[PDB]
Design an enzyme around this catalytic site. Structure first.
Site, mmCIF file in Angstrom:
data_model
loop_
_atom_site.group_PDB
_atom_site.id
_atom_site.type_symbol
_atom_site.label_atom_id
_atom_site.label_comp_id
_atom_site.label_asym_id
_atom_site.label_seq_id
_atom_site.Cartn_x
_atom_site.Cartn_y
_atom_site.Cartn_z
ATOM 1 N N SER A 2 7.069 32.118 19.287
ATOM 2 C CA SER A 2 6.709 32.715 20.568
ATOM 3 C C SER A 2 7.630 32.204 21.673
ATOM 4 C CB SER A 2 5.252 32.445 20.933
ATOM 5 O OG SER A 2 4.527 31.867 19.864
ATOM 6 N N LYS A 12 2.351 28.587 15.585
ATOM 7 C CA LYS A 12 2.395 29.424 16.780
ATOM 8 C C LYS A 12 3.431 30.534 16.681
ATOM 9 C CE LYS A 12 -0.046 26.121 19.013
ATOM 10 N NZ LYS A 12 0.185 26.508 20.432
#
Ligand SMILES: [Cl-]
Ligand SMILES: [Cl-]
Length: 691
Positions: free
Chosen positions: A259, A73
């Protein structure tokens, strides 16, 4: 952890060495600190960053993909910039080049001869062959793609292909003897120029290359009109339309971070500073861009001239683009997943109530319609850009944004000619006529006119919608020339605004007071109905809606308690000449005309989506065989879910097949100027990606 320094990951001893230099010089000039860890491979650096053992690393398109997946991610936070200042390249395009003359399209490649830059290269192979996957008759990774590709084109040049197993793929290659099909300059049909020369030479019918190669290898601007591009919508176009006619946008390498708590700010500060000190031709002491003899592209590509900060809305999927994103996807999927996903239509629902209606539709749809959902309209558009969803119905305001993002209108919601109108069996071909944006007030205060509306309290359907926002704020913007939209009115409900601002002050969220000012139906003052409610319940003094809204909510046309007792005669319209008129007279007392809501999608889905929609509407639309005794696509009892409740049918566009043509120059001129005052995260994201 939790230091002040940015910790960079290197995938080699040589890279590590340059990092330590970097670190040395940043401490030298008193700039942000950089520390260094080392690994043996890109994926090892991606793991390390996911595990907080490092913060940043530069990746190419293929690794940006892997890095975005769970359990990693990561997202791009800064892109490499190539070319020159005042000629910077942040990407290129994978296009398909064929000669001027032919009539075959992207979908009719089977049996022809192909020229590729090389095995497993991006433009020349990964993108084209990922795009053509559905046609390719390929079982799956169990068997090698080369076999199927070799079974699809009659002959190809694919430098680096196994001429033992797949001789077809090497047939048109120009190398002499054993250099034939070589992954090297010893094969004349190798790389970008090679594969193009392979096209020019008549060897092949199509070259899978990048857009720049045509204008670069072509000396005259007349040589090039002998060539066109194949578009994903199955048309052809001239080579300079690549911006609109391409297989993929291939982005520059990017620095990625996590993120959640990525340190993105620290990372950008660092790169900005490093670029200013040790950037191109900034210092003989150390060079951010540049590698020692025998070495190449350590940490960054040697041809980089600086960095561009990636807008925050952008993740890996958006960074890569649907063309690239889906091609990589396609090469890993089974033929089953791919045929299914191709035939199904994924609607995007905004909020929980839309999803409920969608899921109903889905259930009745004979497998042809499925649902995804997001909490905002922009979030849905991003899902469509990523290929996770396919379609939704959008306000003209969002058609503009969707258009800047490269989406296209597919069908339009057709409304009745006048509020008073008979059924039209030929609705589907009846050209749209737009609708009237109005300003509605309660009758009580006779002193309120268009001229005294400023500084009052306002109800808006949502930010960036046409009748609810663009039109009124545009009008106000002319008169005052100010970009201070939050000062036009003392208090508002304008869903989608900053929850802190005055613009959200009148919104009431859901029954529990959650979701205040969110631009979906959880906010009870959202939309046509919500904005009218905001006025009727006396929260605001003026409502910016359409003329049919008042009709749909008065004289018992809306069941809800707040609306049941409302009479038409208790509301008035504000005309631009300072007069007040009854709501039945909007035709001569409106703010402006607004373009019909339209269904938008990707080019690649357009034909399929049309077919599914016309079918579904034949069954569930106003002339519906299963409506109302089963389900009505265009009904939600004064709730306008998925579609507007006053949709007669979905109608064809009559050539108005780009957002610019569908909305008209006038409208587009006007929003454009509006956007000067301010823009949305997705709008900024998409302008970056097209920069
Ligand atoms: Cl390539
Ligand atoms: Cl609106």
């Amino acid at each position: 952890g939790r230091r002040r320094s940015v910790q960079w990951c290197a995938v080699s001893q040589p890279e590590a060495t340059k990092c330590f230099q970097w670190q040395r010089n940043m401490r030298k000039v008193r700039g942000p600190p950089v520390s260094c860890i080392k690994r043996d491979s890109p994926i090892q650096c991606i793991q390390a960053i996911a595990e907080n053992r490092a913060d940043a690393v530069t990746l190419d398109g293929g690794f940006i993909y892997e890095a975005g997946l769970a359990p990693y991610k990561l997202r791009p936070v800064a892109a490499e910039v190539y070319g020159t200042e005042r000629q910077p390249r942040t990407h290129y395009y994978a296009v398909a080049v064929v000669k001027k003359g032919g009539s075959f399209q992207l979908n009719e490649l089977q049996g022809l001869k192909s020229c590729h830059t090389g095995l497993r290269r991006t433009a020349g192979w990964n993108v084209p062959i990922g795009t053509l996957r559905p046609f390719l008759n390929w079982t799956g990774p169990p068997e090698p793609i080369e076999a199927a590709v070799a079974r699809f084109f009659s002959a190809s040049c694919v430098p680096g292909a196994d001429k033992g197993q797949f001789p077809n793929l090497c047939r048109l290659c120009a190398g002499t003897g054993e250099n034939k099909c070589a992954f090297s300059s010893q094969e004349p049909y190798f790389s970008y120029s090679g594969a193009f020369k392979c096209l020019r030479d008549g060897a092949g019918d199509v070259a899978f290359i990048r857009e720049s190669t045509v204008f670069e290898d072509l000396s005259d601007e007349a040589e090039r009109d002998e060539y066109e591009l194949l578009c994903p919508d199955n048309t052809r176009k001239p080579v300079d339309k690549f911006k609109d006619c391409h297989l993929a946008r291939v982005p520059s390498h990017a620095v990625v971070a996590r993120s959640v708590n990525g340190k993105e700010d620290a990372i950008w500060n660092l790169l900005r500073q490093a670029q200013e000190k040790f950037g191109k031709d900034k210092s003989p002491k150390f060079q951010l861009f540049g590698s020692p003899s025998g070495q190449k592209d350590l940490l960054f590509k040697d041809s980089a001239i600086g960095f561009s900060r990636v807008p925050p809305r952008i993740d890996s999927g958006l960074y890569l683009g649907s063309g690239y994103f889906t091609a990589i996807q396609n090469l890993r999927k089974s033929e089953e997943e791919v045929a299914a996903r191709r035939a199904r239509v994924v609607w995007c629902a905004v909020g929980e109530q839309e999803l409920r209606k969608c899921n109903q539709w889905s259930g009745l749809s004979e497998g042809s319609v499925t649902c995804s959902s997001a909490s905002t309209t922009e979030d849905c558009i991003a899902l469509v850009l990523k290929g996770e969803a396919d379609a939704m119905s959008l306000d003209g305001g969002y058609v503009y944004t969707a258009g800047k993002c490269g989406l296209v209108p597919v069908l339009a919601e057709n409304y009745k000619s006048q509020q008073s109108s008979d059924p039209d069996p030929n609705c589907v071909d009846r050209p749209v006529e737009g609708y009237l944006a109005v300003a509605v007030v309660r009758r009580s205060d006779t002193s309120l006119t268009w001229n005294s509306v400023k500084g009052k309290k306002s109800c808006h359907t949502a930010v960036d919608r046409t009748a609810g926002w663009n039109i009124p704020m545009g009008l106000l913007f002319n008169q005052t020339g100010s970009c201070k939209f939050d000062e036009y009115f003392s208090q508002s409900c304008a869903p989608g605004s900053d929850p802190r601002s005055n613009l959200c002050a009148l919104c009431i969220g859901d029954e529990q007071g959650e979701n205040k000012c969110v631009p979906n139906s959880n906010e009870r003052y959202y939309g046509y109905t919500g904005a009218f409610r905001c006025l009727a319940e006396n929260a605001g003094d003026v409502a910016f809606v359409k003329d049919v809204t008042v009709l749909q909510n008065t004289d018992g046309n809306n069941n809800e308690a707040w609306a049941k007792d409302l009479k038409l005669a208790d509301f008035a319209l504000l005309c631009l000449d300072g007069k007040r008129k009854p709501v039945t007279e909007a035709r001569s007392c409106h703010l402006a005309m607004a373009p019909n809501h339209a269904v938008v999608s990707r080019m690649d889905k357009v034909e399929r989506l049309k077919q599914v929609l016309l079918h579904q509407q034949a069954k569930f639309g106003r002339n519906g065989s299963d409506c109302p005794d089963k389900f009505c696509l265009f009904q939600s009892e004064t709730k306008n879910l998925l579609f507007n409740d006053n949709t007669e049918c979905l109608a064809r566009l009559h050539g108005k097949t780009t957002y610019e043509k569908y909305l008209g120059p006038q409208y587009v001129a006007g929003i454009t100027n509006l956007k000067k005052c301010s823009t949305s995260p997705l709008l900024e994201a998409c302008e970056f990606l097209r920069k």
